[PDB]
C-alpha cells in the first residue's frame, strides 16, 4: 500500500515555476509532512527576487497525501494510494473579476522525499488587481474541499471556494477546479464524496532575507 509509506514524518520538496502577466518566477520549498496527524510544517523562498503575486494566492498550488484519513476512513484516500509513483495534478484557479491561474503539478517520491513539481501559467490578471497589485492580507482562512471520484480518469475531482482577505476589508474569491489522475498503472482507490477540512497558518523566519513564506498546516479528510 502507499498509506505504509506515510506512517512516519515524511520529507518534502516543492518546486514551482511559474508565469504570470509574462513575470516569470520561481519557489523552492522544503519541509515535512506527518500524514498521521494530518500536519505539514514548510518553508517557501522565492527564488527568482520578490514574488510577483501575493503568496496566499500559491498556497493551495504549493500534497494532499499528507491529508490525516482516519480509521473509519482508510477506503477513501486517493493520494497515499498512488504512492510511490505519485498522481498529475491539475488546476484552474479563477480569481473572481480578475486572471486566472492553471497549473499541472507531479506529486511523487523522487528517492527519499515527497516531491511536489509544478507549472503554474497565469493570464488576464488586472495590473492594480488584488494580486498584481498586492492588496491581499497575509493570512488564510479555513476551507472545506469537497472530493469526488472520477472513476473514468482513474483518479479524484474537486471543486472548492477559497476566500482571500483583501487588506481594505474584502474578499477576493478564488473559485478552484481540480482532477488528480495517477502516474503509475497500479490499481488505485477510489473515493465516495468526502471532505477535507483545512487549517493554515503563515509566518516569516526573522532570519530570511529572501521573499519567503512559512507555512504550517492542518487538514483532515471527514465523510458523508
Given at each position: 500500500?502507499?498509506?505504509?509509506?506515510?506512517?512516519?514524518?515524511?520529507?518534502?520538496?516543492?518546486?514551482?515555476?511559474?508565469?504570470?502577466?509574462?513575470?516569470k518566477?520561481?519557489?523552492?520549498?522544503?519541509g515535512?509532512?506527518?500524514?498521521?496527524?494530518?500536519?505539514?510544517?514548510?518553508?517557501?523562498?522565492?527564488?527568482?527576487?520578490?514574488?510577483?503575486?501575493?503568496?496566499?494566492?500559491?498556497?493551495?498550488?504549493?500534497?494532499?497525501?499528507?491529508?490525516?484519513?482516519?480509521?473509519?476512513?482508510?477506503?477513501?484516500?486517493?493520494?497515499?494510494?498512488?504512492m510511490?509513483?505519485?498522481?498529475?495534478?491539475?488546476?484552474?484557479?479563477?480569481?473572481?473579476?480578475?486572471?486566472?491561474?492553471?497549473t499541472?503539478?507531479?506529486?511523487?517520491?523522487?528517492?527519499?522525499?515527497?516531491?511536489?513539481?509544478?507549472?503554474?501559467?497565469?493570464?488576464?490578471?488586472?495590473?492594480?488587481?488584488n494580486?498584481?497589485?498586492?492588496?491581499?492580507?497575509?493570512?488564510?482562512?479555513?476551507?472545506?474541499?469537497y472530493?469526488?471520484?472520477?472513476?473514468?480518469?482513474?483518479?479524484?475531482?474537486?471543486?472548492?471556494?477559497?476566500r482571500?482577505?483583501?487588506?481594505?476589508?474584502?474578499?477576493?474569491?478564488?473559485?478552484?477546479?481540480?482532477?488528480?489522475?495517477?502516474?503509475?498503472?497500479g490499481?488505485v482507490?477510489?473515493?465516495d464524496?468526502?471532505?477535507?477540512?483545512?487549517?493554515?497558518?503563515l509566518?516569516?523566519?526573522?532570519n530570511?532575507?529572501?521573499?519567503?513564506?512559512?507555512?504550517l498546516?492542518?487538514?483532515?479528510?471527514?465523510?458523508?
Open positions: 500500500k502507499g498509506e505504509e509509506l506515510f506512517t512516519g514524518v515524511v520529507p518534502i520538496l516543492v518546486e514551482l515555476d511559474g508565469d504570470v502577466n509574462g513575470h518566477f520561481s519557489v523552492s520549498g522544503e515535512e509532512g506527518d500524514a498521521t496527524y494530518g500536519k505539514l510544517t514548510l518553508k517557501f523562498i522565492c527564488t527568482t527576487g520578490k514574488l510577483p503575486v501575493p503568496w496566499p494566492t500559491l498556497v493551495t498550488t504549493l500534497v494532499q497525501c499528507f491529508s490525516r484519513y482516519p480509521d473509519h476512513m482508510k477506503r477513501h484516500d486517493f493520494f497515499k494510494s498512488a510511490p509513483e505519485g498522481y498529475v495534478q491539475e488546476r484552474t484557479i479563477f480569481f473572481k473579476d480578475d486572471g486566472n491561474y492553471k499541472r503539478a507531479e506529486v511523487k517520491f523522487e528517492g527519499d522525499t515527497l516531491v511536489n513539481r509544478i507549472e503554474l501559467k497565469g493570464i488576464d490578471f488586472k495590473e492594480d488587481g494580486i498584481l497589485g498586492h492588496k491581499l492580507e497575509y493570512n488564510y482562512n479555513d476551507h472545506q474541499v472530493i469526488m471520484a472520477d472513476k473514468q480518469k482513474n483518479g479524484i475531482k474537486a471543486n472548492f471556494k477559497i482571500h482577505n483583501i487588506e481594505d476589508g474584502g474578499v477576493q474569491l478564488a473559485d478552484h477546479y481540480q482532477q488528480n489522475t495517477p502516474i503509475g498503472d490499481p482507490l477510489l473515493p464524496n468526502h471532505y477535507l477540512f483545512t487549517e493554515s497558518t509566518s516569516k523566519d526573522p530570511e532575507k529572501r521573499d519567503h513564506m512559512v507555512l498546516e492542518d487538514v483532515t479528510a471527514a465523510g458523508i
